[PDB]
């Protein structure tokens, strides 16, 4: 049995659908990795911070929860090869003609509080000359985009892609900014190398046979 903890709501990586079933890129990858390795998988969804605590306490064996691989984290955890590398970009409504970071001068651009997107906006404000608006969550940010109160909304490519798949009035006309590291499956350092290796090997098999790209496409991720 393999106990994996994750976040409680991070679409399109892990989230509950209309039937309350847990779905998402992380969920689907983990489930297929488990089947390939013949593991009995037990997922839990307490929240990212709680997941880390449970992993450190040995209450679960690993984590998959959009977890960025960083050198600092490698002091505490061992990671798989990244299984997805996210990126930031500016979402606009479908009727907008904005497509260049150098066309943001004097415009308002949104981001969610506490995110890499918000930090990028702070760090690049003097460079590009927009004003910044901060939102509590995605529903609020995208509503402000649809109302014209912001001209663009900085968020993750996979998140915008999924919202587009749901039929929301969104486009991605700008270039992307890669988020370094990528997301990784994590275990405690020096522990459970079996799981990391099994994850890596299954992921390679999934890439080769097309199952990996099928998962991404299911949640609207292309390119």
> Do the beta carbons of residue 203 and residue 81 sit within 8 Å?
yes
How far is Cα 105 from Cα 82, in angstroms, rounded to an integer? 35
For the record, the structure tokens of 146 come out as: 């649809």
The DSSP line for 117-172 is HHHHHHHHHHHH--EEEEESSHHHHHHHHHHTSSSEEEEEHHHHHHHHHTT-S-B-
Question: Phi and psi dihedrals of 103, rounded to 5?
Answer: -110, 20
> Do the beta carbons of residue 154 and residue 7 sit within 8 Å?
no
Domains and CATH numbers, the chain: 1-85+182-223 (3.40.190.10), 86-181 (3.40.190.10)
Q: What resolution (Å)?
A: 1.4
By what technique were these coordinates determined? X-ray
User: What's the half-sphere exposure (Cβ side, CA atoms, 13 Å) at 55?
Assistant: 31
Q: Which candidate, 57, 65, 67, places its Cα nearest to that of 22? A: 65
How far is Cα 55 from Cα 20, in angstroms, rounded to an integer? 25
How far is Cα 202 from Cα 34, in angstroms, rounded to an integer? 8
For the record, the structure tokens of 159 come out as: 């998140």
**Which H or E run contains 35?**
helix 25-36
**C-alpha pair distances (Å), 123 with each of 32, 116, 128, 132, 147:** 39, 10, 10, 11, 26
């Amino acid at each position: 049995t393999v106990k994996i903890a994750s976040d409680s709501s991070y679409a399109p990586f892990e989230f509950q659908n209309g039937q309350k079933k847990w779905v998402g890129i992380d969920v689907d990858i983990m489930q297929e990795v488990a089947k390939i390795n013949d593991w009995k998988l037990e997922m839990s969804y307490p929240g990212f911070d709680a997941a880390l605590q449970n992993l450190k306490a040995g209450q679960v064996d690993g984590i998959i929860a959009g977890m960025t691989i960083t050198d600092e984290r490698k002091e505490t955890f061992d990671f798989s090869n990244p299984y997805y590398t996210s990126a930031l970009t500016i979402a606009t409504t479908k009727d907008s003609k904005l497509s260049d970071y150098s066309d943001l001068k004097g415009k308002a651009v949104g981001a969610k509080n506490g995110t890499a997107a918000q930090t990028w906006l702070q760090e690049n404000q003097k460079k590009y000359g927009y004003t910044i608006k901060t939102y509590s969550d995605g529903v609020h940010m995208f509503a402000a985009l649809s109302s014209g109160n912001i001209a663009g909304a900085m968020d993750e490519v996979p998140v915008i892609s999924y919202a587009m798949k749901q039929g929301q009035d969104l486009a991605m006309n700008f270039p992307s900014i890669s988020l370094p590291g990528g997301y990784g499956f994590a275990v405690m350092k020096g522990k459970n190398s079996t799981l990391v290796d099994g994850f890596n090997k299954a992921l390679a098999e999934m890439k080769s046979n097309g199952d990996y790209d099928k998962i991404l496409k299911k949640y609207g991720i292309t390119a």
